Amino acid sequence: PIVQNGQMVHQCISPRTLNAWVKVVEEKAFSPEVIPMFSALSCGATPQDLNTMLNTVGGHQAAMQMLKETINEEAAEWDRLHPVHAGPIAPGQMREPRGSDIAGTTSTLQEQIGWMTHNPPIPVGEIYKRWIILGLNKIVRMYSPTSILDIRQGPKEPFRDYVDRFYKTLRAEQASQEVKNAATETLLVQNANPDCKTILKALGPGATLEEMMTACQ
Amino acid sequence: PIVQNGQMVHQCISPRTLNAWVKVVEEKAFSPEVIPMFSALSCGATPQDLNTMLNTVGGHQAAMQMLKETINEEAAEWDRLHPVHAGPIAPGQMREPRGSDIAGTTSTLQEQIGWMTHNPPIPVGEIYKRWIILGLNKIVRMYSPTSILDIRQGPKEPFRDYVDRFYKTLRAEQASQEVKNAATETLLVQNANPDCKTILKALGPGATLEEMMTACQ
Amino acid sequence: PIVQNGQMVHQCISPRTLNAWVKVVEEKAFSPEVIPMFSALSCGATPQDLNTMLNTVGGHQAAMQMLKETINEEAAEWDRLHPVHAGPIAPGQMREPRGSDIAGTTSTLQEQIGWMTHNPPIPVGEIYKRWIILGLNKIVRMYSPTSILDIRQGPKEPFRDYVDRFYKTLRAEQASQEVKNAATETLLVQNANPDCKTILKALGPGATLEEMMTACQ
Amino acid sequence: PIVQNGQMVHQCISPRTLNAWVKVVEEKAFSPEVIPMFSALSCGATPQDLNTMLNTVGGHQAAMQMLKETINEEAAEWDRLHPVHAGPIAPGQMREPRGSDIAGTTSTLQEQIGWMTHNPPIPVGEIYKRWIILGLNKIVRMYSPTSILDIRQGPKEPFRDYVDRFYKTLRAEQASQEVKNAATETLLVQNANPDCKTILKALGPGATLEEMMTACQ
Amino acid sequence: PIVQNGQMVHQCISPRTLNAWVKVVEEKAFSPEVIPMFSALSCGATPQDLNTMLNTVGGHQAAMQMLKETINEEAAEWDRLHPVHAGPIAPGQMREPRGSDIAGTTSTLQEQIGWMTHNPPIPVGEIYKRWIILGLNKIVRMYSPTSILDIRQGPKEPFRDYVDRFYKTLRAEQASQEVKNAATETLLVQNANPDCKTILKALGPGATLEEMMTACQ
Amino acid sequence: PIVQNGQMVHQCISPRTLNAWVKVVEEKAFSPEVIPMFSALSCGATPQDLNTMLNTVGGHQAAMQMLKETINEEAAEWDRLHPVHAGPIAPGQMREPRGSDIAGTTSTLQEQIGWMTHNPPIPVGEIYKRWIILGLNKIVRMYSPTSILDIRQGPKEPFRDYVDRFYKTLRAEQASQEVKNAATETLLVQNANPDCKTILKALGPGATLEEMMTACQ
Numbered sequence A, B, C, D, E, F: 001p002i003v004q005n006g007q008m009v010h011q012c013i014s015p016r017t018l019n020a021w022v023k024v025v026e027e028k029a030f031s032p033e034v035i036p037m038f039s040a041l042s043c044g045a046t047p048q049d050l051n052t053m054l055n056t057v058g059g060h061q062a063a064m065q066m067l068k069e070t071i072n073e074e075a076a077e078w079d080r081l082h083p084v085h086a087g088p089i090a091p092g093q094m095r096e097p098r099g100s101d102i103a104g105t106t107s108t109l110q111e112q113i114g115w116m117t118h119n120p121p122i123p124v125g126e127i128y129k130r131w132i133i134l135g136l137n138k139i140v141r142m143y144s145p146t147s148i149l150d151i152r153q154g155p156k157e158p159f160r161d162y163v164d165r166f167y168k169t170l171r172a173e174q175a176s177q178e179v180k181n182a183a184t185e186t187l188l189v190q191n192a193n194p195d196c197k198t199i200l201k202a203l204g205p206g207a208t209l210e211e212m213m214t215a216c217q
């Protein structure tokens, strides 16, 4: 990655970072919590480091191929926004990055450093991570095993356990933060068992999740 | 986080910190000791780092949704206290943070750095951690399985084991430090078994916990 | 903790330190070797770091409550020795610490830093660790399962194994270094089995432990 | 390796790096993901460090012998491109590296440092790693157990599982990124089971992998 | 310990060092290889750090008591060599260390730092480690289970295995490097089985260990 | 070891290095890959550090005694090459190292530092490591269980598995890189099974190992 000692300098990706990423993917596959873990392990990442982390995954090649497809789409839209002059470059001067330069396929580490450490920075690392996360979210959703519609409380299931499944499903199904805030007063109640549902109805509306979990405890 | 090398500079959250947090949550869920562990692992945390740690939790989505609700409440009270001018910002100048800027949802890492490293600091990291801990304590209490009233010494249970359950329950039930200091001379004795209770009564009042544990050893 | 880079600056307590402390307590409870381990893991600790380490212990709440009682006693004796002027403080100036300021309950991290890094230092970290260790030794002794009087050599037990139990018991029972130096020529021999006891008597007095262990090998 | 503290200086290869490399080879042998792992663990590597990592592998001596053969070929082509003057060297001056100097067999660490830290650098580390990776890819391909032609979807096999095997096989068989982009619309469909194949045909052409995986879910 | 950043400054003993020492003692007890491990883990150690490492051992209290006895003897001989003036000390000036100051029982960390960082250094750490190792060697020897005289090659035992037991026993029995160099041509042969003994005799004298192991392979 | 912060300064050998060395010896004994691992773990090692690593090995005392014998031989040849003047040394001046000074038996750490950090360096660490590796290779060869002559392909054994055993045996038997390059066209074929041997003969000469492994796949 790029970090300050100080000044902004390139640092070797650590065995710890490399191992942490591979292990989280081995253990959790594309459970949605893997995404913010990817983001935090890739703190300060050059595009080279981002390729390194993705390339070190041995499984999930279906997913990695879908991710390439997402990255080419984003790359093509970059090149539509920021077309570069095809003429040869000014001696000693910074060339403008292309989609494939951001994706690290046609850029060197040195060019990647040049861009990221420029005043002001061309943040090719951050632009690329954005594309990658956009792609990883598609895969979380694809790999989401269960519709929120099939998350219903078992007659003998503690409410808290039911709500954990519900909001875990909502997260993988990529429901917006609004519909997460809103499903409380709608589908969470409708999908609750009769006993708890009766209690929840009687709370009336405006009931916090904390109050609902209290009520059906 | 933000640390001194020196001067105050941003540092990538470490794989060790990320792994430690996820593991403590996997092993201990919302046992009350998880809170001061969260606090210490989040030493120097930007709001981004605080979101990162919370977002890396894969389970307990019921709890994480309750936490959002706590954070929106605190955020709304911040905005009631410190309303910001809605006009566009002075070129090159620090804008005032809003509730959602402190929660890291509408603020950039750079703005978060600007605030935290300002002279004097606007400690958005520390303000946010406060909100989060307030929220985590609600969840400790919610997840507390047992009323102090049902912590009674078994006829064959060593007093020390009984007292460990008692003060563990009191801690999860969020009893104040006063009522922790006071329950000694009241409920600890009443909830003790007949044999030990007889010994404890005969100590008279003002008996330290050390003296009571000695007495019923 | 506080360390030199250099100059004296505050450093985040490490996940390694946090994990090491919790693990030693999980594995060893209040075996006496846990105390010097606590001392060494808490090298350079602010009172905040000392609270952090104690607060991260999930079990042993009986012990943690006894420790508070020890800390309040020490705190009250501090305040008897070093009463502070109750008037408001000189702008920009260091206030004098109270018992509860040393225990970290009424002091901020910044005040704790101010004191510890002052010329000369007010070593609130070291004063507090002293109180805590005083409290932990009471708990070692309380939790000591066995009187030295019941450490007797089995007829078939190697002398070395008997001496390991004896000096392990003496350590937990908090016997002074004198009585550790002295019990050799008295209780170690009396508690030895007949066979070895006969050999030990015949050594006459002034026999080193090394000579006694040699003699009964 | 060589890193900046600062200035460019030699650093001992870490036990962590050494252990990480040996463990990845023990666990994964020559699965293609081992190559980018080798590349990232060898970040900043001198040729000495590259020999060290390869030499620490205890198994796979067939592969290590093939790798030497690749390295001698590359070395011979270097010497064809950059023949060196056989006359004795200018006192105190940098000699030109030969194929075997790049491979670290006839060069000292100091000469390797001289070259890599020269203005401008002679990047013998990077030139050698290139040769090594060229050699490792031959071995990935050799060790590839299965022709893409024998990756066919089982009648009861989830499409996603079939696609994971397909793109895992394509990767080990070293198929170009074009033929990875292209096999989607050809062999992936032909090798799909009848049920899914019928669905895929009906998508018509231009179907993304994401759409195909959706369609046969 | 004391290290250079730079200049000579005090550093907290690391959790890694603390854990490494306790684990080596748990796994190996007083096998002779534990001594050079103790020496290397205690690199740069103040007497405080040396007490810390010894104090963190939970078992082997027989051994730890023998070690105190060794340390008091060495301490008493120090005080015989370097008696100190009993008069009060020159304000702001370095006092001379006593036996118990070197053993860390009557010295502060600051005094220990003063001595060790003085120009020239009073190396109380190194003087104390010497005493401790002297004491640990007595314990290795005491704890040595087997006389070299009972190391005899089994009729079916590979010579190499016999020699490993022989030189392992010699090491624990603290045989000098001379008698290690010499026992080759004497007791190693006499303690060898008849078959190998016949071969070894026929080598004649001056046979290296390498030649003897070759001969009886 | 000795490293640059910067300037050349002494550093404590790390618990990680100490543990890594002991573990590699516990797991792999004297498999030839242990040697380059020893070399890399001993990067920057003083002779003291080299003694430390060898001394921390608890097993293999037969081997460690053979190693001493190798080191005395090398030491005696050093003293034949570089005899030192037996007169007392120039006050404040660097004495010349003897064989036993290089082996760390008669030299202090400070003298070892003086030599290694001198302008220009007297590289006693590197000279000693050379002696040690020379000695370790003798032991690899001694401990080599199997003649290359007994590495023959089983009728049902994959060629690749046969070649792995062959080149693993060649490595332990310390065959030169020439005879490793050459045995391909000779003994590898002769020791191959009839089926594969027939294929290999028909390749004619000049067949790379890659072509032979392809041919008999």
Ligand SMILES: COC(=O)Cc1cc(=O)[nH]c2ccccc12
Binding pocket: A051, A054, A055, A064, A065, A067, A068, A069, A071, A072, A103, A104, A105
């Ligand atoms: C479409 O652009 C790319 O292929 C970027 C890329 C480069 C690389 O080296 N490995 C990847 C792995 C998985 C997804 C993407 C990539």
Ligand SMILES: COC(=O)Cc1cc(=O)[nH]c2ccccc12
Binding pocket: B051, B054, B055, B064, B065, B067, B068, B069, B071, B072, B103, B104, B105
């Ligand atoms: C209500 O404000 C938030 O949603 C703050 C927040 C942001 C985020 O990225 N993840 C969270 C996870 C768990 C609770 C909160 C948050």
Ligand SMILES: COC(=O)Cc1cc(=O)[nH]c2ccccc12
Binding pocket: C051, C054, C055, C064, C065, C067, C068, C069, C071, C072, C103, C104, C105
């Ligand atoms: C009596 O003073 C205290 O309560 C000090 C203290 C503070 C804290 O945050 N946690 C503790 C845990 C265990 C014993 C003590 C404390």
Ligand SMILES: COC(=O)Cc1cc(=O)[nH]c2ccccc12
Binding pocket: D051, D054, D055, D064, D065, D067, D068, D069, D071, D072, D103, D104, D105
């Ligand atoms: C052909 O050039 C080499 O032999 C380079 C080389 C040197 C070394 O020390 N170990 C190796 C291990 C495995 C492949 C190669 C090498």
Ligand SMILES: COC(=O)Cc1cc(=O)[nH]c2ccccc12
Binding pocket: E051, E054, E055, E064, E065, E067, E068, E069, E071, E072, E103, E104, E105
């Ligand atoms: C005789 O001098 C000592 O007691 C030195 C010493 C101090 C300490 O704190 N712990 C020890 C543990 C084991 C042997 C010795 C000591």
Ligand SMILES: COC(=O)Cc1cc(=O)[nH]c2ccccc12
Binding pocket: F051, F054, F055, F064, F065, F067, F068, F069, F071, F072, F103, F104, F105
């Ligand atoms: C012959 O010279 C030596 O004995 C060098 C040496 C010193 C030491 O402290 N330990 C060793 C262990 C194993 C082989 C050698 C040595």
